[PDB]
Each structure stands twice: as C-alpha cells, then as structure tokens.
Amino acid sequence: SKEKTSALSLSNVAGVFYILVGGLGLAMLVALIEFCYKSRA
Amino acid sequence: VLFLVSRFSPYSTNEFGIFNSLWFSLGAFMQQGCDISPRSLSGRIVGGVWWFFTLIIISSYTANLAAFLTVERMVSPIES
Amino acid sequence: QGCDISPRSLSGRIVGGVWWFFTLIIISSYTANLAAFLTVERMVSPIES
Amino acid sequence: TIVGDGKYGARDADTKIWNGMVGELVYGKADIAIAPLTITLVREEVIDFSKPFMSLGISIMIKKPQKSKPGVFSFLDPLAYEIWMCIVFAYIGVSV
Amino acid sequence: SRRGRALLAVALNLLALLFATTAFLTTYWCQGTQRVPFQLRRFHTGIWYSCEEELGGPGEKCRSFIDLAPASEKGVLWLSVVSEVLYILLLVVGFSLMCLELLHSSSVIDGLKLNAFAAVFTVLSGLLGMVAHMMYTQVFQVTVSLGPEDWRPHSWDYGWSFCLAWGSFTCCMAASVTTLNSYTK
Amino acid sequence: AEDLSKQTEIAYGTLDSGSTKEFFRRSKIAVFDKMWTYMRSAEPSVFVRTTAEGVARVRKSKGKYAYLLESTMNEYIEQRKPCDTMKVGGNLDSKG
Amino acid sequence: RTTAEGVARVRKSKGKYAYLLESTMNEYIEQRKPCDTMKVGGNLDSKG
Ligand SMILES: N[C@@H](Cn1oc(=O)[nH]c1=O)C(=O)O
C-alpha cells in the first residue's frame, strides 16, 4: 500500500541522451564525408 | 551541431544561422515545428535524432505527471 | 498545430518561444488529470451533514 | 534446556556418531525434544516420532528484489521489441 | 573586426580548459553529509578521491572513489573517466589549433581549413564531454542508493566546480560558433 | 528450483547440520541431485551453522545469496521487521 | 457431488468460481485438454 510519488531520475531516460549524442556524431561523420566526395568530383 | 553542419556541407544560400538554428530546435522540442527544413542528409540526421529525443522526454513527462495525480487520488484519507 | 507563418524578430521569437512552453505544460497537464478521473474515481456524496 | 552444541541433528557418515539434538536423545542425555525436528528415515530409525503437529515444506528465501537501476535502453520498455521493428519495417515501406 | 572575433574565441577556449581541469582535479563535485547515530560528517568527492571530513579537527581523510562503487557501475565508471580525460586532451587539441588561428601565427593561406578542423574538434570535445558528465551523475546516484554500508549521504547535492563543469561545456559552444561565424564570413 | 538449477548467478545453500541438507544428499530427483552437487562443489562458505546466520547472510548479500529453509520458518521472517525478504515459488516437498 | 462435476463448473463460471481440491488431482487436470485450469500457490497442507 505504501507507494511513493517519485520523479523520474536521469537514470530512467539515460540512454536517450546517449543515442542523442551518437546521432550527433554520426551526422558529424556524414557532414565530413559528403563534402569530401563533392570536392573530389 | 546543426549550425556547424549547414556551413560545412555544400548541399548557395543557408537559412540555418546561429539565430535561426536556435529557433528551429526549439519548435521541434515544443512539438510545434518550424518553417525551415534541413536539406543536407547530415542535416536531416541531426533533425531526426533530436526529434526522437523530444518524443521520449515529453511522453515521459506526460506519463509521470499522470503518475502523480493518479497517486493523489489514491491517498485514502483515513476516516474511521 | 503550428501555423505556416513564423516570427522573424528576436523579441518576437521570445514571444513565440515562451508561448510554446506554455502550451506543452497545459495540454500535458490536461491529459494527465483526465487520466486521473477515468482511472481512480470518487463518487462524491451529495450530502455530508 | 538448550542443546549444548546447538545443531538440529546430523550424523557423520564416517564416524557414525549423532550430534546435536538427535545425539542427545540417542545417547540418553536429554529426555525429550519438543522442537522443530523433521521426521526423516535416518531419524526414525534412531528415535521414535509421533503424528505431526505441523506440516510444512522447504521454501527458498531471497532478498526482496528492490527496483534496479534501469538499463541503458530502458526507455523503450513500454513497447515490445517486435513493435519497433515492425514500425521501422513499415517506416521504409510507406516512404517507398 | 575579423581579428577581434578570433581573439574572444581563443579566450573562451582558455576558460574551457581552466573550468574543466579545475573540475577534474578538485574533489568538491558532490557536497554531501553523512552521519553516525547524532554526529554528522560533511564530505565532498569527485571521480578520483572521496575526501571526508572528520570531527575533532580538519579531517580530510581521502578515500578512492573508483573501488568505492559496486562492480558493474564501476565498469561504467572506468569508461567515464576515460571519457573525461579524452574531453580535456581533445580540448587541448582544440585551442592549440586556435593558436594557429592568430594572424601573427603560422599562415593566412590555408588558414580557413585550419579553423575548420579545430571547431570540429571542439564539438567532438564537448560531445564526449557532456556524456562524461552524464556517466558520472548516473553512477554516483547508484552509489548513493546502493553502496557499502557505514556511509549513506543525506544530500546528493551538486556543489561548486561541477556547475563550473557545465560552464566549461557551455563555453565550449560559444567559442565554437564564433569561429564558425569566423569561418562563414 | 529449475531456474536456480539453470543458472548460478546467485548462490544458494542450506544449514550445515540439518535434515534439509540431509534430504538433498539422499535425493534422486534429477533437479535436486544437481542442486546437491553445486552446494559441495564450489565453496566459498555455502552452508551456515545457524538459521539467523543465513538470514544475516542473505540480507547483506545484496541479493547474491538465497537461503533454503522450511516454510513456517520462512513466514515468520517475512512478517518481522524489517520485512526485507520474501518466499519464492512454493514448497519443494512434504515434510513433518 | 463428484470431482468431475466440480471441475466442470470451473470451465463454465469464467474464473468466478474456485474449486479447492487435492494437488495430484489438480496436476492431472492441468495436463489434459483444454488445459484451461491452473494450479495457484503451494500446498496448504500435507497428507497421505
Ligand atoms: N531444522 C531442520 C534443518 N534446518 O533448519 C534450518 O533452519 N535449516 C535447516 O537445514 C531439521 O533438521 O529438523
């Protein structure tokens, strides 16, 4: 019967920030390799 | 990151300035949207990942704000 | 439903900024509290004294 | 009286010696044991038992599982893995 | 003008070096207090050494933070410190090429792409930087919840030098957009 | 007891002198004989000499030890302060 | 009246009617079609 009013901690949505930054560096990877190919062609 | 992506890639004219990129990311986060559209593929990635960020957080916010006011009606204010 | 026009002024985008965060609270406040009535119901007594 | 050694009762298979509450009644030191003692066959042969005043079973006691730290990918807990796959499969097709 | 924008961009990077390395060396990230049954002990920790005040004097008994945790969370914590050390050193790669940005420095010609790769690195610094601040606060929170007994902190409150750690990641970006502004103009 | 026989992530034992340990040694059920073999095979100290010692062994293990004991032994620990442990599954066997 | 009638009420009452009975009769009914009755809990008693 003793249930609590608990806010979400950062651990609950923790991986969403991880796949945010992983999605950021992937776009950093693509923004490099799209300018390099047009500079070759 | 989105401001850095628009300048580096060739994809002209660039509607993603440091005043504009802070505006496009806000409308995505408040789920309203904005007028400009990222056109480079690396620009569409940085839009799409921020999109999946704001759909988890707000839905976590709305579920947890339902989670308080569900408990607040099951208090059983002891009567006898 | 974010409309097609978009503000092009800094003091305007402060207005367009703070009005957005007003809505994301209230509508999520509305969905939250309407979950409270359908899940946990209190049939209130019409008289109490 | 407390059992002097403190054990419920056992025999070493090597030395064939009962110790604990069992070894006290077999050797004649104690007179009776009204205690949590199981009626087993190796106890039935050495001492006599009445009908059970209580019946039981062997359970397993663990620490009550508190909520863990949620995982890295614990955000996608409310939907099945099969759903997210079928979304992305359908996300391709509606685009095509 | 265009030399004036490069001057602030390096000086904000030097703030980001000073604010991060302060955080990495100071053991005052988490201002907490612990008690023995009515005596209370203030303490403070970081990633390396948890230094606890003792009564009867100054105290400052310093205990290692890495082995303090349980094992799987420690395994995350092995990756967090490496993520922060790589943030500091790739900040050092950042402003050093911003020292080549200067007009009295190496060259004007092919100086634009020198300004290009460095600001890439400052983004790649703070992205690994913010995650390093993420992985500590998650793991430290577990140690507050599940850690070895005779010490349980009442308040997990984040103190000074860790707000400065957020100010470091803050000033990583304002310096990086201005050299992006210097790249486009 | 099946899943404890499928996985040794959490160690499990009994009391070092008692009919319950004696029951597992004389067991011919394919599960329980496997359960008896692991108790003696790898030993940092598996068995305990006291029930309350094993109760202290479980609660301070952070879920890494499970103490096998009797049913009416186990309901009294669950309705005691601090009510930190619980029964899992059900009774393994009939005893008296 | 008999066990075969009492277990049949469980098939028709849609989970509103529990029929207490012995364990070894409870296991054999579980292993026969429609396999739509489930033992819950452990033994309340021990008999022979
Ligand atoms: N009491 C039982 C044996 N036993 O009791 C425990 O608490 N553990 C255990 O193995 C007996 O031998 O009769």
Side-chain angles (χ1 to χ4, degrees):
Chain A
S1 65
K2 187 177 179 180
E3 293 179 354
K4 293 181 288 294
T5 65
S6 178
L8 288 180
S9 68
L10 185 54
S11 297
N12 298 114
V13 295
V16 186
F17 294 96
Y18 297 160
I19 58 98
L20 178 61
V21 178
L24 287 167
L26 180 61
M28 294 294 286
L29 189 145
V30 176
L32 192 153
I33 65 172
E34 290 295 324
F35 179 71
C36 291
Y37 183 74
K38 301 287 103 175
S39 296
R40 179 68 66 192
Chain B
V1 171
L2 194 145
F3 178 68
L4 192 143
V5 165
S6 297
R7 298 292 191 269
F8 272 88
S9 66
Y11 56 85
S12 178
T13 306
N14 209 165
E15 293 291 327
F16 294 93
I18 197 61
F19 180 69
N20 200 358
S21 177
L22 271 73
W23 178 250
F24 176 74
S25 297
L26 201 280
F29 178 73
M30 302 296 171
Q31 287 181 353
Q32 306 288 325
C34 190
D35 57 357
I36 59 174
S37 177
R39 76 281 307 276
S40 69
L41 192 144
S42 59
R44 295 192 195 274
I45 290 298
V46 67
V49 176
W50 177 253
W51 273 348
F52 184 75
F53 176 76
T54 192
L55 190 142
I56 299 299
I57 295 299
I58 296 171
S59 296
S60 293
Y61 172 66
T62 303
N64 206 173
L65 183 55
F68 284 171
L69 300 178
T70 306
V71 174
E72 291 290 327
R73 292 177 67 86
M74 289 187 287
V75 290
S76 70
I78 301 298
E79 55 89 17
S80 65
Chain C
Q1 281 74 242
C3 192
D4 55 0
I5 55 178
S6 65
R8 295 178 65 87
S9 177
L10 185 28
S11 65
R13 286 183 186 181
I14 295 169
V15 176
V18 71
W19 179 248
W20 278 347
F21 183 74
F22 173 74
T23 63
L24 189 62
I25 300 300
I26 293 298
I27 305 306
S28 294
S29 297
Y30 183 70
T31 299
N33 198 8
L34 202 145
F37 284 164
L38 297 181
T39 299
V40 178
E41 68 276 15
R42 293 182 297 172
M43 294 178 184
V44 182
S45 179
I47 54 169
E48 63 268 15
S49 177
Chain D
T1 61
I2 306 300
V3 52
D5 192 75
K7 292 178 179 181
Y8 289 95
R11 64 98 176 267
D12 291 331
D14 294 331
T15 63
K16 301 290 184 181
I17 299 299
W18 295 97
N19 55 3
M21 296 188 290
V22 176
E24 290 177 350
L25 294 177
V26 174
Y27 292 157
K29 183 256 175 63
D31 298 330
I32 201 167
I34 299 170
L37 198 73
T38 312
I39 301 100
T40 62
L41 276 180
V42 298
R43 286 176 178 171
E44 182 67 28
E45 291 174 350
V46 292
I47 56 174
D48 190 76
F49 294 102
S50 293
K51 298 288 103 178
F53 62 94
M54 186 178 288
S55 296
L56 67 148
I58 300 170
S59 69
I60 301 167
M61 184 182 74
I62 69 166
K63 192 261 187 295
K64 187 189 265 80
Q66 297 293 322
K67 77 280 194 185
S68 176
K69 60 180 290 293
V72 174
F73 287 171
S74 67
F75 66 97
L76 54 90
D77 287 333
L79 262 66
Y81 291 98
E82 297 176 351
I83 303 172
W84 294 101
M85 294 175 186
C86 290
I87 289 171
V88 174
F89 290 161
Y91 171 73
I92 296 167
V94 179
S95 171
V96 171
Chain E
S1 179
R2 76 274 193 190
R3 65 181 182 178
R5 298 292 178 90
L7 189 146
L8 186 63
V10 180
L12 292 175
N13 286 318
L14 294 176
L15 294 177
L17 185 70
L18 192 274
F19 288 168
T21 55
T22 305
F24 184 78
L25 273 72
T26 51
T27 180
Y28 286 98
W29 281 4
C30 300
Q31 299 298 318
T33 180
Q34 66 194 2
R35 62 95 56 86
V36 290
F38 291 165
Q39 301 291 323
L40 58 91
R41 292 179 180 176
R42 178 72 177 271
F43 68 98
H44 53 277
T45 184
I47 50 172
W48 293 97
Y49 289 158
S50 177
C51 297
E52 291 85 6
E53 293 181 354
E54 289 289 327
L55 278 312
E60 289 92 7
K61 181 177 74 176
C62 291
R63 187 176 66 192
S64 177
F65 184 77
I66 291 96
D67 55 353
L68 174 145
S72 66
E73 295 84 3
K74 187 189 294 185
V76 184
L77 184 58
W78 286 107
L79 200 148
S80 177
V81 179
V82 174
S83 299
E84 180 64 27
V85 172
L86 205 282
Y87 165 63
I88 296 172
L89 291 177
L90 266 297
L91 200 151
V92 175
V93 179
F95 69 93
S96 66
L97 276 300
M98 296 296 176
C99 291
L100 274 72
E101 182 182 5
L102 273 302
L103 201 282
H104 68 277
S105 180
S106 179
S107 66
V108 176
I109 296 97
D110 290 331
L112 274 302
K113 65 181 181 180
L114 289 177
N115 302 326
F117 289 165
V120 166
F121 285 160
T122 59
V123 166
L124 291 175
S125 181
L127 291 182
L128 293 170
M130 185 179 70
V131 176
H133 304 298
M134 289 298 288
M135 287 186 181
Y136 174 72
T137 57
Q138 183 179 2
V139 168
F140 175 72
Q141 189 274 127
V142 182
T143 62
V144 174
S145 295
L146 193 149
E149 198 66 26
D150 82 1
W151 65 273
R152 290 295 170 92
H154 283 168
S155 180
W156 59 93
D157 185 78
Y158 296 165
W160 63 273
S161 70
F162 182 73
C163 298
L164 197 72
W166 289 113
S168 68
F169 174 69
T170 307
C171 293
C172 285
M173 291 182 284
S176 182
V177 296
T178 308
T179 180
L180 256 289
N181 195 4
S182 294
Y183 183 73
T184 182
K185 66 174 71 176
Chain F
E2 294 289 331
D3 295 334
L4 284 170
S5 297
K6 295 295 294 298
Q7 188 59 255
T8 175
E9 182 67 28
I10 296 168
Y12 65 100
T14 63
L15 198 147
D16 192 75
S17 295
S19 64
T20 305
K21 173 175 166 67
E22 289 292 328
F23 178 73
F24 289 120
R25 188 180 291 118
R26 65 185 291 165
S27 295
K28 298 297 182 183
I29 298 171
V31 175
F32 291 165
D33 195 7
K34 179 64 176 66
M35 289 180 70
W36 174 249
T37 50
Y38 182 73
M39 291 181 183
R40 53 95 59 216
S41 295
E43 285 184 353
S45 63
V46 172
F47 298 96
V48 294
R49 284 92 173 96
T50 313
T51 301
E53 185 179 3
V55 170
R57 179 66 186 274
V58 172
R59 187 182 292 109
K60 268 67 185 299
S61 295
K62 277 80 173 176
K64 297 298 295 298
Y65 182 77
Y67 180 63
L68 283 78
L69 73 167
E70 293 84 9
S71 70
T72 59
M73 290 292 106
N74 202 359
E75 287 185 352
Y76 184 76
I77 307 300
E78 189 176 2
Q79 280 76 241
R80 185 64 184 90
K81 294 297 296 296
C83 40
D84 197 74
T85 56
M86 64 180 286
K87 290 172 93 287
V88 294
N91 292 320
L92 297 173
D93 52 348
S94 172
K95 294 297 177 187
Chain G
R1 274 80 59 88
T2 187
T3 304
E5 184 177 0
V7 67
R9 182 176 289 177
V10 179
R11 268 71 169 268
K12 68 173 72 67
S13 294
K14 294 182 263 74
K16 302 287 103 174
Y17 182 78
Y19 170 74
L20 278 77
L21 77 164
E22 294 174 349
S23 66
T24 54
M25 281 72 165
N26 199 1
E27 286 189 354
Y28 182 73
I29 295 171
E30 185 176 1
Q31 297 185 357
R32 191 257 185 270
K33 287 186 288 184
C35 299
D36 204 0
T37 60
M38 186 174 179
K39 178 184 260 79
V40 289
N43 294 320
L44 299 178
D45 199 72
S46 175
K47 289 178 180 293

